[PDB]
Amino acid sequence: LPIAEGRWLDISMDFVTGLPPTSNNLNMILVVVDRFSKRAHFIATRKATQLIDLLFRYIFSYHGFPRTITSDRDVRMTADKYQELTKRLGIKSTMSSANHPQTDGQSERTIQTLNRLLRAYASTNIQNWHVYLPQIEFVYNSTPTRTLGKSPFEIDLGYLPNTPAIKSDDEVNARSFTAVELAKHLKALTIQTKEQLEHAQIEMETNNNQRRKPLLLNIGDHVLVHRDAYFKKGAYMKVQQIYVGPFRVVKKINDNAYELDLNSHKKKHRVINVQFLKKFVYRP
Amino acid sequence: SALESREATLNNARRKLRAVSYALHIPEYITDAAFQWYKLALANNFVQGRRSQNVIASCLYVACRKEKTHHMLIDFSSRLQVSVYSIGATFLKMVKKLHITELPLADPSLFIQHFAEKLDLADKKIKVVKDAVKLAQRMSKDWMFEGRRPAGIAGACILLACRMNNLRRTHTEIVAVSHVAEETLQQRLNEFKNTKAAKLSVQKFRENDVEDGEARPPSFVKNRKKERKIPRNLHLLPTTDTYLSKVSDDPDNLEDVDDEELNAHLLNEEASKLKERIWIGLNADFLLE
DNA sequence: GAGCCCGTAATACAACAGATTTTTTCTCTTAGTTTTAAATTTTTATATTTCGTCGA
DNA sequence: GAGCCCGTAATACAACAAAATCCAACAAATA
DNA sequence: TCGACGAAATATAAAAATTTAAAACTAAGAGAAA
DNA sequence: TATTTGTTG
DNA sequence: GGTGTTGTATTACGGGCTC
DNA sequence: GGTGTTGTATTACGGGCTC
């Protein structure tokens, strides 16, 4: 993904569908972490209704409205009622394709870290983890990461409130005292965190693309989709033959995907990331 | 849900409205106002049993009329058989139901600026349209055009402007888009010829046109005198209850109508079989259903 | 070094790791219900439209 | 070269990849 | 080929009085898809 | 003796 | 427009000593 | 006693030419 802009403008959205239920008021955990600062959040839903915009609004609008939402094609976010709200308000939607959760990313990596944290705080205390969920997000917020090297409080306005001890390169370290000069401090943090995000991007690209062969077609081919995101995710995979027909491509929607003319009723989506294509080649 | 059922109906309304607007060539805000009027119509327990094109045509017309424009009901009814006056009747019914307020004026000056490009066009498009609206502005204040089909008065004013100016065009070709009968058209033309002295008709009409009074509409001439020549007091207003009490509704009053009616209330029974012959001849299968 | 052709031939990389139903909203599609307004008559004076016909 | 301590500090490697039902079938536990 | 008239179509406000859609409104039924 | 209930491809 | 991404043991590279 | 293992595109290394 493109790295960032000013703070709290790109937001990653996903959630795990089911947990061992609490007392019958809460069922699953939704997360909001911004692409820039990776700030944890505690959205505890009920596996939901069209009132998603209520809880989501109450928990991001604490900070403010973003520019784009990096999420999956989930029905609570594909959500024609909710999408028109974003089009009117001025919020884009990346909407990662069917069974390709890699784009969500920061939220997926956070729920990876949240799962370990939730296991740590609810090993002997199942069925009431909603009390510990703010502790989960506060612990995630106070712990520095690796790809940025700073705590997500420090990536934002740096006001780690606990202050058990002063960090290295001891200074005033009290951003409450600063009143008008916060602009230069946020500019400095933005510059160093932007170059750190670029460093994380290039490091990821180096350690991943050692074998990733590119595929650049962009027009006029007869590509396939090998029975993943073509049929249902709930459709069972077995020793049944994989004989998906030769489809067609009409548009280059992105560098790493191509839209297809799915010869079905609608298939409800036509965006296929390159991890399912395996371009078909004919012969006269 | 209750809110779920509204969305499909509104989507169908939007699809039909956009389908008609694709042939009507109306701007976006007119369609937006039409859709909000359709929402108001559904909020007023929308008239069921009506054809879909009627209500969307009424909403489109009231939206295109709320801002001064040029579209006419014939354009709404221009698909090979539509029966325009039924659409007009549905619109008239929806006037009271939707309770239209701040009614728009009926002035044919904007009609000419749209009729100019099709029939009787001009090289600069400044002369004939301005001449027609200039003559129409003063012909309106003479109390002659009152409820007389604004398309017809617009076409008549265009013909008058063509007559006073120089334009080699066919007289009968205007009925392609104007859709006005020739009888009322020539009636309005020679009405203008009667009400004008024709002092400088060949060059250019009079530049100071003032007719204070002095003229009457033709319908006033027809039925003011109510014939052919070739703040009252409340006591002067009697109640009609005494008229109903004058005729007796008594059960025994069955013989007060003897004015040879008693001999001829019904057909005679001697000709009942004679009637029945031609009845079973013709009016026989008309009853078996 | 410096590259090239081509002909063999090693070479890390990934699939086999029980498979299926549910769970919670959403979104077309397609058949059944409900409320309501409308197709042919009297009719009454008013007016304008559009045919329809007639005349010199 | 040759190795060692120590102190940072990079570094590929794998986990988030929806959740949870059983299917068929061994053998323990009562009553 | 301009003038001269006849005449149905509407509104109109009621009472009415049998059939005809007819479009909102529910409600399966499939198909997505984390 | 039928209905359970631990664990495992 | 729209398409990975960090936590984690594990391991590699400079000051200071022996040369 | 008892605990990975090959199919597959992909890529690396010798004879023969130019040096």
XYZ file of N, CA, C and O (backbone and C1' of nucleotides) in Angstrom, chain A residues 8 11-12 29-44 59-60 62-63 106-107 109-111 113-114 117 132-143 145 151-153 155-156, chain G residues 7:
203
model
N -3.988 9.754 11.024
C -5.391 9.314 11.028
C -6.108 9.686 9.728
O -7.167 10.313 9.740
N -7.134 3.989 7.342
C -7.606 3.137 8.426
C -7.844 1.735 7.880
O -8.429 1.568 6.804
N -7.374 0.728 8.615
C -7.546 -0.670 8.243
C -8.668 -1.300 9.060
O -8.741 -1.110 10.278
N -14.754 -9.300 18.264
C -13.928 -8.105 18.394
C -13.621 -7.552 17.008
O -13.199 -8.289 16.109
N -13.866 -6.256 16.837
C -13.495 -5.493 15.654
C -12.340 -4.573 16.022
O -12.246 -4.112 17.163
N -11.453 -4.314 15.067
C -10.251 -3.532 15.323
C -10.163 -2.380 14.333
O -10.564 -2.506 13.170
N -9.666 -1.245 14.814
C -9.292 -0.121 13.968
C -7.861 0.243 14.331
O -7.589 0.622 15.476
N -6.945 0.091 13.379
C -5.590 0.613 13.501
C -5.278 1.395 12.232
O -5.596 0.950 11.122
N -4.734 2.594 12.399
C -4.418 3.417 11.244
C -3.126 2.939 10.595
O -2.248 2.384 11.259
N -3.033 3.132 9.278
C -1.866 2.676 8.529
C -0.602 3.410 8.956
O 0.492 2.834 8.930
N -0.734 4.665 9.380
C 0.425 5.460 9.772
C 0.934 5.066 11.155
O 2.070 4.602 11.301
N 0.105 5.244 12.181
C 0.562 5.157 13.561
C 0.324 3.800 14.208
O 0.960 3.512 15.229
N -0.565 2.980 13.645
C -0.930 1.662 14.177
C -1.433 1.771 15.618
O -0.839 1.251 16.562
N -2.554 2.470 15.763
C -3.153 2.764 17.057
C -4.278 1.774 17.321
O -5.242 1.714 16.555
N -4.170 1.025 18.414
C -5.094 -0.065 18.685
C -6.475 0.455 19.084
O -6.631 1.577 19.572
N -7.484 -0.393 18.884
C -8.855 -0.044 19.226
C -9.650 -1.293 19.587
O -9.290 -2.416 19.227
N -10.755 -1.064 20.297
C -11.443 -2.069 21.101
C -12.882 -2.339 20.681
O -13.718 -2.661 21.532
N -13.173 -2.280 19.384
C -14.560 -2.281 18.922
C -15.140 -3.671 19.174
O -14.838 -4.623 18.451
N -15.970 -3.795 20.205
C -16.520 -5.082 20.623
C -17.955 -5.183 20.116
O -18.870 -4.582 20.682
N -16.192 5.260 17.440
C -14.833 4.892 17.812
C -13.770 5.447 16.850
O -12.619 5.640 17.259
N -14.122 5.793 15.598
C -13.070 6.514 14.873
C -13.257 8.020 15.008
O -12.271 8.760 15.085
N -13.954 9.668 17.410
C -13.168 10.126 18.543
C -11.940 10.898 18.068
O -11.589 11.932 18.644
N -11.280 10.414 17.012
C -10.212 11.171 16.363
C -10.733 11.989 15.184
O -10.639 13.219 15.188
N -2.386 -4.358 8.517
C -2.150 -3.807 9.850
C -3.189 -4.272 10.863
O -2.852 -4.560 12.017
N -4.456 -4.356 10.453
C -5.470 -4.904 11.346
C -5.297 -6.408 11.527
O -5.493 -6.927 12.630
N -2.405 -7.998 11.319
C -1.237 -8.167 12.171
C -1.549 -7.767 13.608
O -1.008 -8.347 14.559
N -2.441 -6.791 13.785
C -2.851 -6.400 15.126
C -3.652 -7.503 15.807
O -3.413 -7.805 16.981
N -4.590 -8.133 15.087
C -5.351 -9.228 15.690
C -4.473 -10.453 15.881
O -4.785 -11.316 16.707
N -1.359 -9.954 17.020
C -0.836 -9.535 18.315
C -1.935 -9.496 19.371
O -1.677 -9.757 20.552
N -3.166 -9.168 18.969
C -4.276 -9.157 19.918
C -4.606 -10.563 20.401
O -4.935 -10.751 21.576
N -2.272 -11.425 23.014
C -2.600 -10.609 24.178
C -3.897 -11.067 24.833
O -4.001 -11.100 26.066
N -11.197 -6.929 29.723
C -9.765 -6.832 29.470
C -9.427 -6.259 28.099
O -8.262 -5.922 27.871
N -10.402 -6.156 27.189
C -10.134 -5.609 25.855
C -9.556 -4.189 25.849
O -8.630 -3.939 25.053
N -10.036 -3.221 26.657
C -9.294 -1.947 26.739
C -7.874 -2.099 27.248
O -6.988 -1.357 26.807
N -7.623 -3.047 28.154
C -6.249 -3.304 28.577
C -5.429 -3.878 27.432
O -4.243 -3.560 27.297
N -6.051 -4.713 26.590
C -5.371 -5.252 25.413
C -4.933 -4.123 24.492
O -3.775 -4.059 24.058
N -5.853 -3.202 24.198
C -5.523 -2.129 23.267
C -4.549 -1.131 23.881
O -3.683 -0.599 23.181
N -4.653 -0.876 25.188
C -3.710 0.033 25.831
C -2.310 -0.567 25.886
O -1.315 0.151 25.740
N -2.213 -1.882 26.107
C -0.915 -2.546 26.092
C -0.318 -2.522 24.690
O 0.869 -2.220 24.518
N -1.133 -2.807 23.665
C -0.661 -2.705 22.284
C -0.221 -1.283 21.958
O 0.725 -1.076 21.190
N -0.900 -0.295 22.534
C -0.581 1.097 22.254
C 0.709 1.529 22.938
O 1.474 2.324 22.384
N 0.960 1.038 24.150
C 2.142 1.460 24.891
C 3.414 0.727 24.481
O 4.508 1.198 24.812
N 3.311 -0.399 23.776
C 4.491 -1.178 23.414
C 5.039 -0.717 22.073
O 4.288 -0.690 21.088
N 6.793 -0.838 18.452
C 6.851 -1.836 17.396
C 8.259 -1.877 16.806
O 9.180 -1.216 17.290
N 6.640 3.737 20.158
C 5.296 3.406 20.603
C 4.269 4.161 19.763
O 4.523 5.296 19.354
N 3.116 3.552 19.473
C 2.080 4.255 18.697
C 1.542 5.523 19.347
O 0.976 6.361 18.636
N 1.676 5.691 20.666
C 1.532 7.029 21.235
C 2.578 7.985 20.681
O 2.254 9.117 20.312
N 4.205 7.755 17.862
C 3.949 8.008 16.446
C 2.850 9.050 16.284
O 2.900 9.893 15.382
N 1.843 9.012 17.157
C 0.899 10.114 17.309
C 1.512 11.197 18.184
O 2.740 11.259 18.326
P 4.893 -5.620 16.091
O 5.193 -7.087 16.647
C 4.121 -7.985 16.896
C 4.609 -9.351 17.374
C 5.704 -9.357 18.426
O 5.517 -10.488 19.259
C 6.522 -10.339 16.421
